[PDB]
Write an enzyme that holds these catalytic residues in place. Structure first.
Site, PDB file in Angstrom:
ATOM      1  N   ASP A  17      -9.499  -5.877  -2.809  1.00  0.00           N
ATOM      2  CA  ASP A  17      -8.666  -6.130  -1.641  1.00  0.00           C
ATOM      3  C   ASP A  17      -9.545  -6.248  -0.396  1.00  0.00           C
ATOM      4  OD1 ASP A  17      -6.305  -6.528  -0.285  1.00  0.00           O
ATOM      5  OD2 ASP A  17      -5.689  -4.425  -0.296  1.00  0.00           O
ATOM      6  N   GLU A  96      -2.294 -15.191   2.440  1.00  0.00           N
ATOM      7  CA  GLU A  96      -0.963 -14.983   2.991  1.00  0.00           C
ATOM      8  C   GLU A  96      -0.522 -15.939   4.095  1.00  0.00           C
ATOM      9  OE1 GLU A  96      -0.227 -10.838   3.387  1.00  0.00           O
ATOM     10  OE2 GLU A  96       1.743 -11.058   4.322  1.00  0.00           O
ATOM     11  N   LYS A 132       0.548 -15.610  -0.728  1.00  0.00           N
ATOM     12  CA  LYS A 132       1.260 -14.360  -0.477  1.00  0.00           C
ATOM     13  C   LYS A 132       2.371 -14.538   0.544  1.00  0.00           C
ATOM     14  CE  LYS A 132      -0.881 -10.438  -0.117  1.00  0.00           C
ATOM     15  NZ  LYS A 132      -1.876  -9.359   0.148  1.00  0.00           N
ATOM     16  N   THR A 157       4.386  -9.895  -1.543  1.00  0.00           N
ATOM     17  CA  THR A 157       3.858  -8.658  -0.992  1.00  0.00           C
ATOM     18  C   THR A 157       4.838  -7.877  -0.112  1.00  0.00           C
ATOM     19  OG1 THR A 157       1.897  -7.710   0.126  1.00  0.00           O
ATOM     20  CG2 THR A 157       2.775  -9.794   1.013  1.00  0.00           C
ATOM     21  N   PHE A 179       3.713  -1.904  -3.044  1.00  0.00           N
ATOM     22  CA  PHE A 179       2.854  -0.990  -2.298  1.00  0.00           C
ATOM     23  C   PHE A 179       2.940   0.459  -2.752  1.00  0.00           C
ATOM     24  CE2 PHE A 179       1.359  -3.082   1.872  1.00  0.00           C
ATOM     25  CZ  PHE A 179       1.224  -4.320   1.252  1.00  0.00           C
TER      26      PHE A 179
HETATM   27  O1  LIG Z   1      -3.243   0.422   2.930  1.00  0.00           O
HETATM   28  S1  LIG Z   1      -2.901  -0.321   4.065  1.00  0.00           S
HETATM   29  O2  LIG Z   1      -2.187  -1.546   3.503  1.00  0.00           O
HETATM   30  O3  LIG Z   1      -1.707   0.432   4.651  1.00  0.00           O
END
Ligand SMILES: O=S([O-])[O-]
Ligand SMILES: O=S([O-])[O-]
Lengths: 321, 321
Positions: A17, A96, A132, A157, A179
């Site tokens: 990432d 994105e 994204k 996402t 997430f």
């Molecule tokens: O981990 S950051 O995407 O909040």
């Protein structure tokens, strides 16, 4: 004696990432993911100024009013990082769409198609790209349209609620990025429990629930856990299809030599207590609203990425005119 | 002369309660109820005759329990409404199940059913204001009810400027922009725990909406709702209407400080703002830009749904074994 990172790869496909592509190869990931915030941060690093300069020159060369030149430069910039990243990996790269388009289905479809054309212009086929999109109802339908009408593969996402996960499965999108870390954030700030055991982490529980549903009912959409606060969350999700991790946590995993075992499996999913549901727009909006954390985090995630777009365009505007 | 009587010279007073046996004490013009107030009222010994009547009504109509319970709760809402109207010269607001907040067609139908029940009780729709959550769907539901059926609506849970604009363009009869819950959010999410009246964020919200409405000539009635103190109420003197709890009305009656109007159609003409139009996607975006509004609208819906569920439980326990 293999590191936790090497072991994890036996049960899950590792994804990096970051937009800092020079730091990717050390972790030998399959795919890589970027987002408005990561591109903004990378565009500010001295090591990548040539990309910023090329983006600026691209926009200026095409000319037109500021709006046009900025759109060309910022999209070109996103693509330039994507292309450099692809040279460091054997897989796909996620790019994105501007978050300010999150509630505009047709605009996201057009912007996604535009990004693909820019990649092609740069000699990159759409098969190595994942567009994204924010997982709003409009974003999910945009994804369904992109997949079914254009063969453009999407990465949904800012996915927090079970409703979003169900909507994405029904949409038939290529991949989702549920997430983990931001869910932990919400619970720490909104409840009396400020710490959790890995398997008890609310973000971990969310991805687990989504993963089981998907595998139990045979949806082909790839499940990629994203956003992590610690390696405990990552380990607790080994077995998940994919997991995109920051260079920092990837470094921790590479240094760690303790044994790892997968917590997620297709077989365990088939026996889970998931119950198949179908959501039209109104059903989705209600079910999503029942998840306070998800409502607030999707909403805030959109504002934050839009702010990163605004800041990046400002940085460009001050160097282009 | 009390602050209450002074206020009445600049604003039409409305009583926010379902406790009709004493709702004429402060001589209000209109009255407002909501899922929470009805639930509270239905549990009062003094109104058990209404509950028994509602129960008997639902049973006579027959059908599955779910249908008898629905007819009973709707009959109850109308029963309270009818009793309130016997005590006041104006209108009474009756809210549609918040669980329908994202279902335009269901809200339209439920509103028509309520109006039909009122007609059975001998009440014309002129004495009624159907309350609807101010989601995009609720706003469009109000628009359809007004234009197609002449059913007047009170758009509630209104927090953002976007919702205000949407309601104005929909031509709804009245809006209930909140004040107290906006203060709640700022107290809980900022370091500032106290505000002088004109600095109160809820006061500022209604002020912005009022000035916009009067400046551009919209006919929708502006009624500030939800109050934490008399300071907020006084700061909105001049607003078309203000619905206040019996408790705060008592405080205003006992208060004898001098009051000056803060809002006026004349002053609104020089307020700072441009007229805008919002289609669905533009609305969803502008609303999302207001974190407080996104969160309060969403939570307000969950809360009222919880009240409907609790009231249904109370009834089922008294209607069936
Ligand atoms: O981990 S950051 O995407 O909040
Ligand atoms: O509506 S109550 O929060 O003032």
């Amino acid at each position: 004696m293999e590191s936790a990172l090497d072991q994890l790869k036996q049960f899950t496909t590792v994804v990096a990432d970051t937009g800092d592509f020079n730091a990717i190869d050390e972790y030998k990931p399959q795919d890589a993911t970027t987002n408005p915030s990561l591109i903004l941060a990378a565009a500010q690093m001295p090591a990548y100024q040539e990309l910023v300069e090329e983006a600026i020159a691209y926009g200026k060369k095409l000319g037109g009013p500021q709006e046009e030149q900025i759109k060309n430069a910022i999209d070109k910039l996103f693509v330039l990082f994507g292309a450099e990243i692809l040279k460091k990996i054997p897989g796909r790269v996620s790019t994105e769409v501007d978050a300010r388009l999150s509630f505009d289905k047709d605009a996201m479809v057009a912007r996604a198609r535009r990004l693909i054309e820019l990649y092609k212009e740069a000699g990159v086929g759409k098969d190595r790209i994942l567009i994204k999109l924010s997982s709003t109802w409009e974003g999910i339908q945009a994804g369904k349209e992109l997949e079914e009408q254009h063969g453009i593969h999407c990465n949904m996402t800012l996915l927090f609620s079970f409703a979003q996960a169900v909507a994405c499965a029904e949409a038939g999108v290529t991949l989702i990025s549920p997430f983990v870390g931001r869910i932990l954030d919400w619970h720490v700030a909104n409840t009396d429990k400020k710490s959790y055991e890995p398997q008890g982490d609310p973000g971990v529980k969310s991805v687990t629930k989504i993963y089981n549903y998907y595998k139990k009912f045979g949806y082909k959409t790839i499940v990629m856990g994203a956003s992590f606060r610690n390696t405990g969350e990552i380990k607790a999700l080994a077995g998940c299809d994919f997991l995109t991790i920051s260079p920092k946590l990837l470094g921790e995993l590479l240094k760690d030599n303790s044994k790892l075992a997968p917590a997620l499996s297709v077989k365990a999913a088939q026996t889970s207590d998931s119950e198949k549901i179908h959501l039209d727009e109104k059903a989705f909006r209600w079910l999503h609203n029942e998840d306070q954390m998800a409502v607030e985090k999707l909403s805030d995630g959109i504002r934050k990425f839009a702010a990163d777009a605004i800041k990046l365009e400002r940085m460009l505007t001050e160097r282009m005119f």
